[PDB]
Amino acid sequence: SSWWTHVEMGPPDPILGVTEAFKRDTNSKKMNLGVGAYRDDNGKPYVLPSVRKAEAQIAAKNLDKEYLPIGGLAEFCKASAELALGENNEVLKSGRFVTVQTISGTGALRVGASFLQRFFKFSRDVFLPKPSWGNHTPIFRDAGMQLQGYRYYDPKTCGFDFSGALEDISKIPEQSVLLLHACAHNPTGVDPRPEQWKEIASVVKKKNLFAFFDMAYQGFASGDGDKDAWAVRHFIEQGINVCLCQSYAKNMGLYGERVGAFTVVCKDAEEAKRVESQLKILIRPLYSNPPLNGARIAATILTSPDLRKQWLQEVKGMADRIISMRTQLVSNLKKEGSSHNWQHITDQIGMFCFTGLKPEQVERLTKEFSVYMTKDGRISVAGVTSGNVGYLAHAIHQVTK
Amino acid sequence: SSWWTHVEMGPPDPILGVTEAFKRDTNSKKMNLGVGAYRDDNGKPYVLPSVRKAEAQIAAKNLDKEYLPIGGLAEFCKASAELALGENNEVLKSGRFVTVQTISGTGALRVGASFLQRFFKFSRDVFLPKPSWGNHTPIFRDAGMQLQGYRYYDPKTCGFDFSGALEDISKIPEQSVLLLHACAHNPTGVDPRPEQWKEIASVVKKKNLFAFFDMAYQGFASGDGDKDAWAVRHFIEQGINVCLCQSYAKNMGLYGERVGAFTVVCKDAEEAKRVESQLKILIRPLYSNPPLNGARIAATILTSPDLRKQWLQEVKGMADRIISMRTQLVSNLKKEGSSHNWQHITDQIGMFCFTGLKPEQVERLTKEFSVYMTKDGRISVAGVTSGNVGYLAHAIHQVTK
Ligand SMILES: Cc1ncc(COP(=O)(O)O)c(CN)c1O
Ligand SMILES: Nc1ccccc1C(=O)C[C@@H](N)C(=O)O
DSSP: OOTTTTOOOOOOOHHHHHHHHHHHOOOTTOEETTOOSOOOTTSOOOOOHHHHHHHHHHHTTTOOOOOOOTTOOHHHHHHHHHHHHOTTOHHHHHTOEEEEEEEHHHHHHHHHHHHHHHHOTTOSEEEEEESOOTTHHHHHHHHTOEEEEEEOEETTTTEEOHHHHHHHHHTSOTTOEEEEEOSSOTTTOOOOOHHHHHHHHHHHHHTTOEEEEEESOTTTTTSOHHHHTHHHHHHHHTTOOOEEEEEOTTTSOOGGGOEEEEEEEOSSHHHHHHHHHHHHHHHHHHHSSOOSHHHHHHHHHHHOHHHHHHHHHHHHHHHHHHHHHHHHHHHHHHHHTOOSOOTHHHHSOSSEEEOOOOHHHHHHHHHHHOEEOOTTSEEEGGGOOTTTHHHHHHHHHHHHO | OOSSTTOOOOOOOSTTTSTTTTTTOOOTTOEEOOOOSOOOTTSOOOOOHHHHHHHHHHHHTTOOOOOOOTTOOHHHHHHHHHHHHOTTOHHHHTTOEEEEEEEHHHHHHHHHHHHHHHHOTTOSEEEEEESOOTTHHHHHHHHTOEEEEEEOEETTTTEEOHHHHHHHHHTSOSSOEEEEESSSOTTTOOOOOHHHHHHHHHHHHHTTOEEEEEESOTTTTTSOHHHHTHHHHHHHHTTOOOEEEEEOTTTSOOGGGOEEEEEEEOSSHHHHHHHHHHHHHHHHHHHSSOOHHHHHHHHHHHHOHHHHHHHHHHHHHHHHHHHHHHHHHHHHHHHHTOOSOOTHHHHSOSSEEEOOOOHHHHHHHHHTTOEEOOTTSEEEGGGOOHHHHHHHHHHHHHHHO
């Protein structure tokens, strides 16, 4: 026989399928609204000029390639916590926190999930919004935790079901884990507003729930990193000792460099010391130590004041392009004579948008218009450009009118 | 009152607790023989010139930083199986394998572990040699396998306990997994000879054991890649469908770039496709996709005939400097007047040496002489220079006379 005769073929990657179907289409009008990364106004990858500058200035220094500590680059870790929390947060000043470098946002989630499995004796349940990032489920599941849900997306408004979400969260059994997207919910782009978050924080604190924030889009979501991190900060100001996942894939465009971090906010520095040793003991048999290159870039940008300013402006410019496209999409839908409400499109935030389109309409969009997207109605806004937005509005109008 | 009050401080690393009494040691001829990376004759980190040239050719190409496929850089994966097996290997001509890019050797070990856990229905037992790389145990425990052991190091001879190894391997329940260091065993330096391997390969095939190679040192071990890969190639040629972990940390000096690869040899190409689908399902919730920088560098070296040829001669310089410190230590111990047989310092292969020094004597070298090594009597040969080898012979002779 063979060792692996009984190993089945896994399911096809559905996004990969869309992107590949997109590549084969010879329609000069085609659009890839399944792309999982930022694109410029001509549909190209974008390497941030501040990143190119940072890299050049690293190359000039003739650095070694030695192993990083298990927790990664110490100055990346510190700059990264400062970015998330704000430079004068009481948490930094007291040092009641540990931040370790991870293999991007996914890496941070996987290391968090392993830490919960092993140390969060209070629960095995992690509550995910409905819906959540697809990979959140297998992450927590392979880490050895259980998944639950809470109402989030409202398919009747294509907005935030605040009343269902709040009701649900108030009946989560006490001391469960509640996963929260910091901003730019994936896949819907629907976010709670600041008053909604205050209410959610107040139930969390009341019911003694543990808040696990996923933050893949600070800055990138609105152009304002302080506004994007406001919820996380606010939960911390209210007495909630969150844990936090950060990713530099979108905000710095470091996708393939794999740069992210996991932070546990603790009672005090001594507790953070013990959490850190235990994070290290878990990190080491995953991958020993994290990659160097991307972390060098991020630290150089975050700790150099000229490079940081330049970086903040470039982030603001990506965020601005996405906001532009949503607006111009809604505008064009009106010119077309659409009579549907499309404000969810300007109401949502980040590069992912739940359109409210039905699966049959999506199929018309692929077949008749060569507009490629997933069956759940999710478009990646990064595939919209000023050149093709008029066409998108037309196509969508045709399939919905 | 806190989520983490019961999280205990982990034990202090030995390899980091002594490495830091070392600076405080003020004596002028002091050596750190506990470093786990190659150092040159002046004790410095060494970036290979071919790596430097590959970096510069890459810079000029102005490449993007987009995500890799879950399995990493296709061209790195293919060049890497070719490095391991020989470009005219049977296995590669027929396509009966899958190679995925991983987070160095450690990530290949964890990915493979997690594959065994989910798909190796035959058993939960993994046989490690006594002793093995420390991280092998938590890697497999955390992944959800059970650890067993087989006799390997012969403390009487500081060499290979062939008969013991073989009796142990002969009594391994059929369809258990057997882990093997491909060459340069870590931590001891003690490898089987080609005729010894032929007999391990016989037991493995007859008793239907699964063979898991860990190959961290190809070319860096002996100076000769084909010779270092020989036992892996032999097993396959013997009808053994191995899996294989590679690392470019030491041979390319790509430590902190985290470059490695995990290979499963299968009965045919359709099995490889099934297996590959399943490695992808395991990798995605670990870290989604692998780091770009290192693999780009490795791939560039391996797919350019000129560069590849240069890199192999740099690998040979490192292997050779290590062989040279090995032979110089033995002669200098003679020169000093030692009576003991020290041919083991010289039969042993790669950057790690089990010296045979008892724990008391280890203490004496640290206090009396300022020679820092771990208590098991292991030294890093990379920390021996032509500069300090004289003094080391003197110090070792004293404590052993
Ligand atoms: C909510 C969320 N969390 C985590 C990630 C992972 O990002 P990465 O591993 O590329 O850093 C993403 C993007 N897929 C995300 O949208
Ligand atoms: N390819 C990735 C690589 C790294 C991290 C995430 C991804 C994703 O696919 C997730 C997100 N972009 C999603 O909408 O599909």
